[PDB]
Design a protein around this nucleic acid. Structure first.
Lengths: 49, 238, 148
RNA sequence: GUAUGUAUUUAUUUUAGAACUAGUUACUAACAUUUUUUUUUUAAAAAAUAAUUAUAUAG
């Protein structure tokens, strides 16, 4: 799906974009020791037509 | 975020000499990489040269006596330009020997690398400081402070946390005592089957093997005193 | 009305936004101790906590929450409230020995130290915002004392 | 990423201060993917060249 195909998204047939970039997110926090640790937070799977 | 210094031979300032001295006092002579890590813009070998050539108090920086000076002319005659051997024969640093030999036989641009920088005099500093030198002394005090391992530092932390945990555990009991419900103190659990509780018994009680004298009334007097102390701690609370 | 604070037995403080379930700020040190009471000063640039090591530390209410020290009282046993003047220059605390302590917020100097009838200690100390120079202390003794 | 350790009680035992402000350093974090060969002048001139990458690391 390049920029020269670009209008193929707008045919009649149904299709979906899936995206994962916000699925695994974390927050960094200080531990009791020197090093920091990551704890996961909520995410979303971004699918649209 | 600092761009890399690949060649670290520079001019020894005052700051780096003093951090090298207060690093050699703690780290000792034979660890040089751990000394030169403390002061950036210099190398472990150049720290070794700056100690063994200039900053060492055993080294002999005085004026030459007349016997010393004639000894220098004669030794420079016998051993042709072998200046480490000559300086070993005089117990003086070799750069002092070479410059004083030039002074006997007599009677740098900019953008050059000075090879003899470790043997030369220091540069005193401008009045306030530079910013990187503030950072250098801050991290140098931070690294000269610590004398602990990982296990011992974690032990400090665990003792403080167990202390505050006991305080909270007594706080809730005192609140419930005010309410009128007396929760007894739970004991720590045993990590193995014959782990010893130390209020049940005198654990390895050794009797003092009696002698000729008589100790009945003193036994009674001690037993009276201890019973009265326990009652007073029960009522009034120490 | 947006964020809030909690303290816990595990010697840390967290700050949440209203319903996010993510702590945006963890106030945790090595030599810290847990605080059984939090309060926010009326000038709203600081909130302060009564710590277990018989002191009172104070942190910012603005972002980059960071840490004055109010000392001179023994409150390690019980967990004791603290209040503020309705002008914002005085902080008042209780004690395990039935006396309250009033510091000046502007300089952290212990101004006065007033004892209270009743052998039992005093925990809840509350100030009247309208009528100035009026405190009420009370504790395990049971009566409710109106201090000047 | 492991090792390893720590946390998880209910079935009730008798009575000198106040305010405003932003970036610089270190360290840590299994958390995250804008071509090649030159030449020439002091931005412009020349020459050139070819249906698309891994979920894999531990004492």
């Amino acid at each position: 799906l390049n920029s020269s195909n670009y209008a193929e998204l707008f045919n009649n047939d149904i299709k979906l974009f899936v995206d994962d970039t916000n699925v695994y997110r974390v927050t960094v926090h200080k531990t009791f020791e020197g090093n920091v640790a990551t704890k996961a937070i909520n995410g979303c799977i971004f699918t649209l037509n | 975020p600092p761009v890399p210094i690949y060649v670290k031979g520079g001019v020894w300032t005052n700051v780096e000499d003093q951090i090298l001295k207060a690093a050699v006092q703690k780290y000792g002579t034979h660890q040089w990489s751990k000394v030169a890590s403390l002061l950036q813009k210099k190398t472990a070998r150049q720290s070794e040269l700056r100690w063994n050539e200039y900053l060492n108090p055993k080294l002999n920086f005085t004026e030459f006596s007349k016997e010393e000076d004639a000894q220098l002319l004669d030794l420079a005659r016998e051993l042709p330009n072998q200046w480490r051997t000559i300086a070993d024969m005089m117990a003086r640093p070799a750069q002092v020997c070479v410059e004083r030999y030039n002074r006997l036989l007599e009677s740098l641009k900019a953008g050059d690398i000075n090879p003899n920088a470790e043997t030369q005099m220091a540069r005193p500093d401008n009045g306030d400081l530079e910013d990187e030198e503030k950072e250098m002394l801050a991290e140098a005090r931070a690294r000269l402070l610590n004398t602990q391992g990982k296990k011992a530092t974690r032990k400090i932390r665990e003792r403080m946390l167990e202390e505050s945990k006991r305080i909270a555990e007594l706080q809730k009991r005192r609140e419930l005592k005010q309410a009128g419900i007396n929760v007894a103190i739970k004991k720590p659990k045993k990590k193995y089957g014959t782990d010893i509780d130390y209020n049940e018994d005198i654990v390895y009680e050794q009797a003092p093997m009696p002698g000729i004298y008589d100790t009945s009334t003193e036994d009674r007097q001690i037993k009276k005193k201890f019973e009265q102390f326990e009652r007073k701690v029960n009522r009034k609370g120490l | 009305g947006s964020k809030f604070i909690s303290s816990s037995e595990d010697k840390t403080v967290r700050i949440w936004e209203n319903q996010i379930n993510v702590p945006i700020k963890q106030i945790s040190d090595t030599a810290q101790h847990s605080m059984p009471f939090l309060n926010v000063h009326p000038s709203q640039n600081y909130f302060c906590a009564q710590s277990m090591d018989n002191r009172i530390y104070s942190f910012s209410l603005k972002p980059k929450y960071k840490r004055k020290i109010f000392k001179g009282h023994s409150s390690a046993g019980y967990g004791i409230s603290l209040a503020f003047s309705g002008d914002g220059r005085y902080i008042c605390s209780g004690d395990s020995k039935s006396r309250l302590f009033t510091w000046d917020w502007n300089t952290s100097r212990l101004l006065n130290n007033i004892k209270i009838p009743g052998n039992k200690p005093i925990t809840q100390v509350d100030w009247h915002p309208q009528e100035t120079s009026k405190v009420i202390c009370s504790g395990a003794a049971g009566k409710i004392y109106v201090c000047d």
